[PDB]
Amino acid sequence: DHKALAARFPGDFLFGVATASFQIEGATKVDGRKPSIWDAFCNMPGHVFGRHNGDVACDHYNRWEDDLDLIKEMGVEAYRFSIAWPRIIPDGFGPINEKGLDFYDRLVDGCKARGIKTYATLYHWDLPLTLMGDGGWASRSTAHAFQRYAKTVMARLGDRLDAVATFNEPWCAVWLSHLYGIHAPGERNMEAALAAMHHINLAHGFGVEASRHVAPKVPVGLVLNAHSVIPASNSDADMKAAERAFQFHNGAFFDPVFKGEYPAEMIEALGSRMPVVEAEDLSIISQKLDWWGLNYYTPMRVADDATEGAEFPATKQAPAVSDVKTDIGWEVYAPALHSLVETLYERYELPDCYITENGACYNMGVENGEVDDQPRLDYYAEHLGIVADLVKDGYPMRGYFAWSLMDNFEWAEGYRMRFGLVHVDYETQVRTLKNSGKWYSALASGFPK
Amino acid sequence: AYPMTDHKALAARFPGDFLFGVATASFQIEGATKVDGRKPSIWDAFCNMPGHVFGRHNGDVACDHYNRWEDDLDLIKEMGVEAYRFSIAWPRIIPDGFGPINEKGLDFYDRLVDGCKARGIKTYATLYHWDLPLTLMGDGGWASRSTAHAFQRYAKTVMARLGDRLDAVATFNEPWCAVWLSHLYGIHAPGERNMEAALAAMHHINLAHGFGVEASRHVAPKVPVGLVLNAHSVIPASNSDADMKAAERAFQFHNGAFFDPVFKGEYPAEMIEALGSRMPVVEAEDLSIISQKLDWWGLNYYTPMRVADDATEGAEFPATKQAPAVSDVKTDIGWEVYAPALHSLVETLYERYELPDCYITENGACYNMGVENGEVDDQPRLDYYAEHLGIVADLVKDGYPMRGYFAWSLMDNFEWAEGYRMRFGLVHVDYETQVRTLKNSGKWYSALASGFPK
């Protein structure tokens, strides 16, 4: 019931839809764009389902205007999107591609004209392939390449952008990419991952300073998939495990940014294998942010792992409690969102919070010109209920972005896992608003009240 | 009869027109990785990502050959060595792999080749010695058929500029390493561990070879064209039917994957029965392009590949396991020293395939002694050479068409995943000062080589 739900939100609550450059743009060799690490990852057998790539995607490069009109037609106030570094500074370092900047300049103008608020992400995983030559995120120079990139983007767009986030999900860009081998560039090495960790925290810091020098009026933030870690049992071992898991999976990012230090027990275990931390790094990393973005889908259930030699945090996956499952296999368990936010604000001194991603994978398509995705609607109703509870509890929840305006390239899953509020037929590129989308549109349309 | 040095007796065993040389590769020696238009290679990436290369050693400086190439040629000349085997850096010539030609890159090798000419040094150029331009990884690298066409255009470009002067050209060095070691075993760049990726690399490298032969002959029909393979000397633990069959599967996978398409115009049957379903598309003219006639071929040999049948259920083709060394004699990199395996390998290859003239394009030993009283006392390296060159002389006597020999390493250099720690040179390089010091093995090789041509 979208009307009773709406009553629970503040009149100025910000409702948005979210998207990412490589996931929707296509046009991967157009107008000066050079390859990203995800172009490489996709095209090498073994990394991405069906060897699907980003060559066409949702063809958003060519269709961005229709897509903006759709957002306006849905009555959603805000659009969260990412900027492709491979379009802006195609080799990572090197000459600026003014035609790359022109694309986003035009996009942002289109949003201004339509009253659509802009929440731009500078880095949503599409590192220019050339920078891998230096070591990619394992090299400190890559943080400096980002520093110059951030400045370049904000100099052009900073007069109009409503908000900017430096990074989306360091957890993925760091551990999932350099320790687990699941995301580009597909490494499985603790030294590599620890270097990526510190250099992405540092690049974030560089990005905050750069954006504020060239565009001091734009609210700066950082988007994190903080994990709602829940121990398998109430045993002491599982409790301590949950904490180690929290320090490694969340603390590696939250503690430097919000406390100016790394988690102590993690440094004991892993500190000797870290890159150099120069005198000024932690103070740069921990500059005050104007907001922060939480991406949430599912809890991280953990159990202690007693296996000899097991690297910190020494945990293993614990089974789901709920029996509800999205088509990508993720447990649906809404109250974990509540305990997570509760935990974070207790543990850290945080600015205003926007839910920058929330959504569900369900793969139903078009029948009778419609898409019946009731389980996605239910997912949204339930988690938005939680967000409303957090508002009532007094937490500074200022907005919410649904992950996925439309079905798109879902990283290692390719195009098989659909997250969209809008259905895309990849053969025809036809957009079809789903029932979840119609529902979300009705909710969002009445804001601001 | 009166006492004679070992090198003098050995020299008498070689024909008067025998070709002696020394060998290098571009990324291993050049340095200057970011100057004059060069863009990164997959090895720059591999080196700089922790975990892949010892000490995270990279090619940024190496032997500084890009700036010292003339000194290095004067060294060859002084050593009395007739031929120089070197590689050309694709990242210097066509820096994005595809795309615009970098004239400054071509100029470097143009000048190098003129320097060799001026000194009377024969040039044996390798077009691809593993330094694929990083940008090509974007389309899938060797897993993408397009890369074979990128190589084709690079080969054509190089040969159109240098073909009037080169004495010989090889398309590829060691497909085995660029394919399996790089895409299945994850040890060389780009560091993949995937049969599908590896099989694609296998065919596309074979295809690229053929494209290169055609391209070279199209624009430089006078240059003898070959291919350099580290063909493995496969030795079963026993002559039990099971081990003899394992040795056959090993041969097909480790050698046949390259020799059969190039020299028979087909892939080995039992390998296809096992791996065919995961191979990329083989188009109509493919095997015909791959199997063009070569003017020579290069054998890289260091150590045998001893194998036994692996009975473990589900074991992927060729389903072998390591068999014990017959000797405890090992180089500092850990490889068994067993010179007779070179005879049995050459005997095997010449009876199984119709081959052109053979040049040993790599042979050498890792021994890590440095400078003491201004000399390098590397007798085990000298011993390794005397023994293996003895085998090469045996092969000449046994009627095999061995035309020449290139000692692997003119000097110490970047040894891939081993970094600078593993030294193969006839000449020592102090990486702090860049000073070159001819080792005792180098003096011995110079003495042998200087007498040729007789």
JSON list of N, CA and C in Angstrom, two decimals, chain B residues 44 95 98 148 215 324 346 447:
[
{"chain": "B", "resi": 44, "resn": "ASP", "atom": "N", "xyz": [54.48, -5.75, -18.10]},
{"chain": "B", "resi": 44, "resn": "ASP", "atom": "CA", "xyz": [54.57, -4.61, -17.19]},
{"chain": "B", "resi": 44, "resn": "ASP", "atom": "C", "xyz": [53.49, -4.77, -16.12]},
{"chain": "B", "resi": 95, "resn": "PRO", "atom": "N", "xyz": [52.00, 0.53, -30.26]},
{"chain": "B", "resi": 95, "resn": "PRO", "atom": "CA", "xyz": [51.88, 0.57, -28.80]},
{"chain": "B", "resi": 95, "resn": "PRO", "atom": "C", "xyz": [50.53, 0.14, -28.24]},
{"chain": "B", "resi": 98, "resn": "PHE", "atom": "N", "xyz": [46.74, -2.73, -31.84]},
{"chain": "B", "resi": 98, "resn": "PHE", "atom": "CA", "xyz": [46.19, -2.21, -33.09]},
{"chain": "B", "resi": 98, "resn": "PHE", "atom": "C", "xyz": [46.54, -0.72, -33.12]},
{"chain": "B", "resi": 148, "resn": "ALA", "atom": "N", "xyz": [45.35, -12.17, -33.40]},
{"chain": "B", "resi": 148, "resn": "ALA", "atom": "CA", "xyz": [46.17, -12.79, -34.44]},
{"chain": "B", "resi": 148, "resn": "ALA", "atom": "C", "xyz": [46.31, -11.84, -35.62]},
{"chain": "B", "resi": 215, "resn": "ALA", "atom": "N", "xyz": [52.88, -12.69, -44.08]},
{"chain": "B", "resi": 215, "resn": "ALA", "atom": "CA", "xyz": [53.15, -11.26, -44.07]},
{"chain": "B", "resi": 215, "resn": "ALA", "atom": "C", "xyz": [54.63, -11.02, -44.33]},
{"chain": "B", "resi": 324, "resn": "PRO", "atom": "N", "xyz": [60.92, -39.03, -11.43]},
{"chain": "B", "resi": 324, "resn": "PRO", "atom": "CA", "xyz": [62.20, -38.63, -10.81]},
{"chain": "B", "resi": 324, "resn": "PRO", "atom": "C", "xyz": [63.35, -38.37, -11.77]},
{"chain": "B", "resi": 346, "resn": "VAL", "atom": "N", "xyz": [65.83, -34.38, -30.48]},
{"chain": "B", "resi": 346, "resn": "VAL", "atom": "CA", "xyz": [66.06, -34.09, -31.89]},
{"chain": "B", "resi": 346, "resn": "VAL", "atom": "C", "xyz": [65.81, -35.36, -32.75]},
{"chain": "B", "resi": 447, "resn": "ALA", "atom": "N", "xyz": [86.07, -18.21, -27.23]},
{"chain": "B", "resi": 447, "resn": "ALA", "atom": "CA", "xyz": [87.18, -18.96, -27.82]},
{"chain": "B", "resi": 447, "resn": "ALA", "atom": "C", "xyz": [86.69, -20.00, -28.83]}
]
